[PDB]
Amino acid sequence: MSSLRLVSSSTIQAANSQLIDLTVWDLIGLERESIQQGLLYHHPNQVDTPNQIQHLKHSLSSTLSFFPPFAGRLVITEYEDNTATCFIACNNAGALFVHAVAENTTISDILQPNKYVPPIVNSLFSLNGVKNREGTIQPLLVVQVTELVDGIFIGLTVNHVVADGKSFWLFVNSWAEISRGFQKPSKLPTLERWFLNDTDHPIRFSFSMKFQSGQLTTRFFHFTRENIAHLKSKANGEVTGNTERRISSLQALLAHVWRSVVRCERIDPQEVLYYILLIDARTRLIPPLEDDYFGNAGDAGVVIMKAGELLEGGLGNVAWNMNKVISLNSDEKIKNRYKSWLRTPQLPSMGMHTTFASQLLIIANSPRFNVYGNDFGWGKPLAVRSSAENKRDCKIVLFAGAEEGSIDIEVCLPYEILEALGNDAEFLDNH
Ligand SMILES: CC(C)(O)[C@H]1CC[C@](C)([C@H]2[C@H](O)C[C@@]3(C)[C@@H]4C[C@H](O[C@@H]5O[C@H](CO)[C@@H](O)[C@H](O)[C@H]5O)[C@H]5C(C)(C)[C@@H](O[C@@H]6OC[C@@H](O)[C@H](O)[C@H]6O)CC[C@@]56C[C@@]46CC[C@]23C)O1
């Protein structure tokens, strides 16, 4: 019979004071969840496991020297007028390293064949459910390494006020390099964060103030490079007037997934639908931020369409609308939205009351993040998984696929819609 237990929990400080001021993008995450993603590895041959665990521990400490925020803590000051400030103290209080053993549990137990994410996956991460503002006391980075019969799982819990998805995977890429023998990471973070004026920080903000919540389930779908290329051509072929074939591969796929989810739920064609993209500000500010700007730097772009138009209007029209919402996130709108936020600095509510699954769909992560380059010395990973802690939001999480140019999507929806999707030949997934 299989089981799961914790062997040890250890504080990891940076191998070798300063403060970081947080900007609007960072503060918005204070009352939300951590990023919880991890990497699954197969051990074809025998491995000296105590030596592997020790090597991950020491290479983690070496990497933290280059990313001191992950070894620090948040500092929150609450004021009588119900406002607050927040910053990161790089005080080297340390990350947390959790060593767990899943007896009689295997790779294939974790990757159930073309099925749903099994419950064991959520236990491969530590500090599940902890909101980011609890980083005043809790580590900003927790690493759980779980031993399996035929491999290991490396699961990270990262405070979303400190880092977005891009920065999460910058750190993982850099940790893998250090573990492989690199002296320094190949990409060094930019740690000073963005404000329109030096006088803005510390920003003084206020805290506080869903269909089938708690009942959602999670399933992965795989999209080959070919099927993606097929959808891009189709979408661009349907919008000829004014096109140099500028609908991207990702836009076409996301448009296709949106249509497929709505098709499978079978809803009134008068329903209004909201599709939440996160648009990176790094490349869009003038002057742009550094590519390796370490923090949050992205804004919701909300695509809105009637269900009837979404389906009856064709793939290219949906993808064209997405392309246009992305294009409106200009340097002007980023800066004006920032300025407008400073004058009503309220952390957001997570939005409307939803009465069906397709109503509000959140798109997270990106296929541009490097998942399969994370060789720590024992080979590339077999798969990427998240904690699947979320059972509240209808959500699509994007991952680079194992094959060149493919994409894995992790879909969190009611079970019956995920079943319809897996039986829909128009949904052009594979495996
Ligand atoms: C266009 C309309 C008609 O007005 C309206 C109708 C209403 C709505 C559908 C819009 C609101 O209008 C604003 C809206 C987007 C909310 C406020 C947030 O958006 C931020 O709102 C603040 C202001 O409060 C802006 O300044 C930021 O630019 C913006 O980003 C976001 C995030 C950032 C927390 C978001 O989380 C990221 O999901 C992507 C992942 O990749 C990341 O991991 C992850 O963090 C989850 C969704 C969520 C909660 C909601 C939900 C949907 C809302 C409620 O559109």
Author numbering: 1 to 16, 23 to 215, 221 to 251, 253 to 443
Could you give the paper's own sentences about this structure?
Here we report a saponin acetyltransferase from Astragalus membranaceus. AmAT7-3 is discovered through a stepwise gene mining approach and characterized as the xylose C3′/C4′-O-acetyltransferse of astragaloside IV. AmAT7-3 is a rare multi-site acetyltransferase which acetylate large saponin molecules. We solved the crystal structures of AmAT7-3 and its variant A310G in complex with astragaloside IV, respectively.
The variants A310G and A310W were found to catalyze specific C3′-O and C4′-O acetylation for astragaloside IV, respectively. MD simulations showed that the substrate binding is relatively stable in both AmAT7-3A310G and AmAT7-3A310W, with only one major conformation. As a result, the sugar ring in AmAT7-3A310G rotated counterclockwise by 80° compared to that in the wild-type, while in A310W it rotated clockwise by 30°. For A310G, O3 was almost perpendicular (92.9°) to the plane where the C = O group is located, while O4 formed an angle of 47.8° with C = O plane. The vertical position was more favorable for the nucleophilic attack reaction. As a result, the O3- acetylation was kinetically favored over the O4- acetylation in AmAT7-3A310G, which was consistent with the biochemical experimental results. QM/MM calculations showed that the energy barrier of the first reaction step was 19.9 kcal/mol for the O3-acetylation and 30.0 kcal/mol for the O4-acetylation, respectively. The A310G variant catalyzed 5 to generate a single product with a conversion rate of 96.3%.
